[PDB]
Design a protein around this ligand. Structure first.
Ligand SMILES: *C(=O)CCCC[C@@H]1SC[C@@H]2NC(=O)N[C@@H]21
Ligand code: NA
Length: 1130
């Protein structure tokens, strides 16, 4: 009673997965076959064995009989089961199996030929006494044949709900069909099947006139069918099992088989398609996949799956079994409601609407219905995207700064919340942030809208519309928001908010990390965003709280009028003379700063006076005197990346390697969200208390929404002079209890710094113990404590505990920390593949040479700099990377759990420096060395300042699908160990793809780091260690420190042409990178002409219409103002 020992599936997707469940249950070994895009699919995983066919297309792989038959040969499969599609109804193939001693689980090549031609099929039907055609339904009969003249009708299905002939919903039993006519569909089907000596499963389709009560032969499908599961629900038969048993001549005894149909059952087909744009296939990575577990769902997808446009966009078949038609229709609606699939556009909403219709319920179904079905998405549609339009929410992705997950959310949080409030949204509603110029949107449903923020002209069906007022939108309406004239950004709110899944607590988009928002990115031409109409929705979005209302005008923020701004900050952490000269601190607050073309949500870069440093270098943390033992920064901090500063904003870095001078006050950050290149700013010192006042005034303004409650910067709010950021110093007491320095670090945090400016492993354990002391006292008011190398940043809620109070608890819990030199900690050991100096790492330096700084003591090659400043061979550097034991000291250096690690061997600690200024771009998985520290850049496209050395795999698993035992996206924890092992660039790209699909087995072992054992290891090597240390710096390192400190050059300061040229202008201000085309090249419409760097992005300015490149205006290094002429095409 085992038909076959091993069976191959000549198929992919959902049918392959379903055939395999049966095979498994039957104890039959299964064999997968896959194309190249399918190498990661469920059916390949589920099988006992598998054979790569090589190639991409249907024809190259699944359809190539030769390959298939070789595949079954190679694995010793006694049988091939084909599914449907592909070689399923291909008779040469059925015949090849036969002529090869492989049993084709299907009918004979002859029967397939006899049924393939529209007219041979008609004769058989006639001879079989099947009524033929001498508002149409589609009723089909599922039949089984034993290949020896016996045939049995298993039931009928209605498949009327078809769109341009493609089935979407099927059901059984057929509704509104009398027994007289069902029993005679059955018997006709059995005659047809008998006459053929039909073998295995086939379907006889009929046309049915419901009114006339008549049916007519349409065709036989000589195979199993996609909708077969509804039949299985009502009979309890496993049709694949039957096929297998029949195909091996161990058929069920047909004359004695009693089939009972029990209840009613319905199936909906979930496709990766867009119903709003013509059912156009929608490829991409599924980001979250949830199905009702109580329905039967035949699928091949889960969180993680990459859905391609190649084969057929089926995702899942959702199958429900009810007591009767009405029970099943309700079940199906619940199932559809409970189906959450995100990452691709689906037809779920289209399905929901159909499953829900009065039509479907009254059973007024016909092969024609779906072709004139009124489908309206409760949603908008992007007719044009705008330069950078993102779904955001507020406060954003909070909870995870210690990991280096930024909050994201709106860059100007005040306007954002006004916009929300104006429409009466709960404050958690998501909205769109428009940057520089907005989208044009088509609304498919009705709602209220508002726009707030910068000055932008806004259109509804072409009539100007007011900002800060609730505008009523109709359906067919086109809202359009143009260029931002004053400020950078505006906010478009929609009553009820926008419907997008949360990631890590928030619907905010973090584009760098492909996280959150509308599928991890800015909006695109063609996107379709869903709203939350309470009557037409099943949504978890928070319902509005308030009736809409124009914002009182006294509550509007005062944007600058003339590209010039005063911006309030709290002094600290590092605006003190241990780091900067006195006069430089004065100049910092006295002079104006100009906003630099490289500014974006990661941070806003500034041009102004160059620093005078109090130290000659930064020692072990890097030579440049701004370099600091990596510590966690504050939102709003003004970070000195070498000799130039940048304001850390809501998509910004967290654990970082440079000093911060001051921090924009929480409530002042909105200003920074409205800066545009060329703006001037001046930082204005502000006391902790004043900073709280502004903030609280914004909350009251938003909460009550009442004239006069907004406070803003004014002279009597401003400190006379910058103050000292050092809040208190505890003196050093003993070896394990170092000095403690408490620095004010923003409106929201106190930075605690241990020791002298120096690394010491004990201090890392100590930070762990401080954190533990706060948990033990369960202190009220503390928001998040973030570990750095020798510091921890403590975020508080000023409405729960004030600055002074938190300082004193901290000073006090500090004396409660007790531990000895012999401590231990759980430590995970990661062994990670790394390519030395591969192409993507080197190209990162190249881009830095050609876009920012082309000469520097650490250029042209970073490894050579490490080698040279340390007096070793480059291969000595390579050797240490592959023998060092890197202990993670903190996360988010920089972004998504990017580690800051330090070799456990002191002889592995090399002098170095961090870039001056930092890069704007780094490749995912790049490994860096910053002074003596090591990092892995977990995110693609991140600013970075470490010396680049090679590349591993990201230690951030966004969807937690990797093959490892870690339960969240950040794979590392402080005190873990990373070791590198050598692979080739190409071997690394294999691993990278494999790991992105969860098919790479990360080498991780749980263990324990023991400081007692470690201190003993230092002893048996103390000699070598000391020799190494005494001989490290010198005059050579000092010349380097001198050279490293030279500020980069100031950017550059910024005739007749043929009569009907295309003149080409850059939209943005940026520095000219490189040309794309050569003068005299032919270009098409769209083709690139030149490249700019603007806003940390590689900006292609391209040809409008086709032509020849007549002139290209700039060379590498030129500044280009927005609206400047950049090329001419003739
Ligand atoms: C735009 O370039 C914003 C950059 C913010 C500062 C960058 S992030 C990585 C470097 N490390 C660091 O501590 N600051 C630099
Ligand atoms: Na605050």
């Amino acid at each position: 009673k085992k038909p076959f020992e091993t069976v191959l599936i000549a198929n992919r997707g959902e049918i392959a997965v379903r055939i395999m469940k049966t095979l498994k249950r039957m104890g039959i070994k299964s064999v997968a076959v896959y194309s190249d895009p399918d190498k990661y699919s469920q059916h390949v995983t589920d099988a006992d064995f598998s054979v790569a066919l090589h190639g991409r297309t249907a024809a190259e792989t699944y359809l190539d009989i030769d390959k298939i038959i070789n595949a079954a040969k190679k694995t010793g499969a006694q049988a091939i089961i084909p599914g449907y599609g592909f070689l399923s109804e291909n008779a040469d193939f059925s015949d090849r199996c036969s002529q090869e001693n492989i049993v084709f689980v299907g009918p004979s090549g002859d029967a397939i030929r006899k049924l393939g031609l529209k007219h041979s099929a008609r004769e058989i039907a006639e001879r079989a006494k099947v009524p033929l055609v001498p508002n149409a339904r589609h009723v089909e009969i599922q039949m089984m044949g034993d290949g020896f003249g016996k045939a049995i009708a298993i039931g009928e299905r209605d498949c009327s709900l078809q769109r341009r002939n493609q089935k979407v919903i099927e059901e059984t039993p057929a509704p509104n069909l009398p027994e007289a006519t069902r029993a005679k569909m059955r018997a006709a089907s059995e005659r047809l099947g008998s006459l053929l000596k039909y073998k295995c499963a086939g379907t006889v389709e009929f046309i049915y006139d419901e009114q006339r009560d008549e049916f007519y032969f349409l065709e036989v499908n000589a195979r199993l069918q996609v909708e077969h599961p509804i039949t299985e629900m009502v009979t309890g038969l496993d049709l694949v099992e039957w096929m297998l048993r029949i195909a091996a001549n161990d058929s069920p005894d047909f004359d004695n088989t009693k089939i009972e149909v029990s209840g009613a059952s319905i199936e909906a087909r979930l496709y990766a398609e867009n119903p709003v744009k013509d059912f156009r296939p929608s490829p991409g990575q599924l980001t979250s996949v949830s199905f009702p577990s109580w329905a039967r769902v035949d699928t091949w997808v889960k969180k993680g799956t990459n859905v391609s446009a190649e084969y057929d966009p089926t995702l899942a078949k959702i199958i429900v079994h009810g007591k009767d038609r009405n029970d099943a229709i309700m079940k199906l609606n619940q199932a559809l409601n409970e189906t959450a699939v995100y990452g691709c556009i689906t037809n779920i909403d289209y399905l929901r609407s159909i499953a829900s219709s009065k039509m479907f319920k009254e059973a007024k179904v016909a092969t024609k219905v779906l072709d004139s079905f009124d489908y309206k998405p409760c949603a908008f549609e992007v007719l044009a995207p705008g330069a950078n339009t993102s779904v955001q929410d507020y406060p954003g992705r909070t909870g995870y700064w210690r990991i280096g997950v930024p909050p994201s959310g709106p860059m100007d949080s005040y306007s954002f919340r006004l916009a929300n409030r104006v429409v009466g949204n709960n404050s958690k509603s998501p909205a769109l942030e428009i940057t520089l110029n907005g989208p044009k949107l088509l609304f498919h449903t009705e709602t209220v809208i508002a726009v707030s923020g910068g000055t932008v002209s806004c259109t509804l069906n072409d009539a100007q519309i007011a900002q800060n007022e609730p505008i009523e939108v109709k359906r067919g309406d086109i809202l359009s928001v143009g260029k931002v004239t004053v400020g950078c950004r505006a906010y478009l709110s929609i009553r009820g908010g926008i419907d997008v899944p949360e990631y890590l607590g928030s619907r905010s988009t973090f584009a760098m990390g492909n996280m959150g928002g509308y599928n991890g990115r800015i909006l695109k031409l063609g996107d379709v965003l869903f709203l939350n109409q309470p009557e037409l929705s099943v949504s978890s979005l928070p319902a509005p709280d308030f009736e809409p209302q124009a914002a009182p005008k006294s509550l509007l923020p005062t944007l600058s009028t003339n590209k010039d701004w005063k911006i309030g900050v709290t002094c600290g952490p590092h605006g003190s003379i241990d780091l900067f000269k006195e006069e430089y601190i004065e100049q910092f607050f006295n002079d104006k700063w100009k906003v630099h073309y490289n500014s974006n949500r990661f941070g806003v870069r500034l041009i102004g006076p160059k620093p005078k440093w109090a130290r000659s270098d930064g020692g072990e943390a890097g030579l440049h005197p701004s370099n600091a033992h990596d510590y966690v920064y504050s939102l709003g901090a003004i970070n000195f990346t070498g000799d130039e500063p940048v304001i850390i904003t809501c998509d910004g870095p967290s654990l970082g390697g440079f000093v911060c001078q001051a921090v924009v006050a929480e409530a002042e950050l909105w200003k920074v969200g409205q800066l545009t290149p060329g703006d001037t700013i001046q930082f204005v010192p502000l006391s902790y208390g004043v900073a709280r006042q502004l903030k609280e005034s914004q909350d009251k303004s938003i909460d009550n929404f009442e004239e006069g409650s907004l406070l803003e910067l004014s002279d009597d709010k401003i400190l006379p002079k910058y103050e000292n950021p050092i809040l208190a110093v505890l003196p050093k007491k003993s070896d394990l209890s170092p000095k403690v320095t408490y620095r004010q670090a923003g409106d929201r945090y106190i930075l605690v710094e241990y020791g002298e400016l120096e690394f010491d492993l004990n201090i890392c354990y100590r930070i762990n113990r401080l954190i533990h002391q706060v948990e033990r006292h369960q202190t009220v008011g503390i928001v998040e404590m973030s570990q750095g190398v020798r510091s921890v940043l403590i975020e508080f809620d000023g409405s729960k505990i004030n600055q002074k109070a938190l300082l004193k608890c901290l000073i006090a819990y500090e004396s409660e920390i007790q531990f000895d030199k012999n401590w231990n900690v759980k430590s995970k050991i990661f062994k990670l593949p790394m390519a030395f100096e591969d192409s993507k790492t080197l190209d990162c330096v190249t881009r830095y040479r050609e876009t920012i700084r082309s000469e520097a003591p650490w250029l042209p090659n970073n490894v050579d700099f490490i080698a040279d400043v340390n007096d070793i061979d480059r291969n000595d550097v390579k050797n240490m990377l592959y023998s060092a034991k890197f202990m993670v000291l903190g996360l988010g250096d920089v972004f998504l759990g990017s580690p800051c690690a330090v070799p456990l061997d002191p002889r592995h600690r090399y002098l170095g420096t961090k870039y001056n200024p930092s890069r704007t771009y780094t490749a995912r998985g790049v490994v860096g060395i910053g002074g003596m520290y090591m990092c892995i850049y977990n995110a693609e496209g991140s600013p970075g300042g470490y010396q680049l050395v090679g590349r591993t795999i990201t230690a951030w698993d966004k969807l937690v699908i990797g093959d490892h035992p870690i339960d969240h996206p950040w794979l590392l924890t402080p005190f873990d160990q990373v070791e590198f092992y050598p692979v080739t660039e190409e071997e690394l790209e294999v691993i990278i793809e494999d790991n992105d699909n969860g098919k790479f087995k990360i080498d991780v072992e749980e263990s324990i780091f023991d400081h007692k054992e470690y201190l003993a290891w230092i002893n048996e090597n103390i000699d070598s260690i000391v020799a190494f240390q005494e001989a490290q710096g010198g005059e050579k390192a000092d010349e380097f420190a001198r050279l490293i400190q030279v500020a980069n050059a100031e950017l550059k300061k910024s005739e007749e042409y043929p009569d009907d040229a295309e003149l080409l202008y850059s939209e943005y201000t940026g520095r000219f990178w490189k040309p794309v085309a050569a003068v005299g090249d032919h270009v098409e419409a769209g083709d690139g002409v030149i490249i700019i760097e603007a806003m940390k992005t590689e900006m292609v300015v391209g040809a409008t219409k086709s032509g020849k490149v007549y002139k290209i205006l700039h060379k590498n290094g030129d500044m280009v103002e927005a609206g400047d002429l950049v090329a001419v095409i003739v």
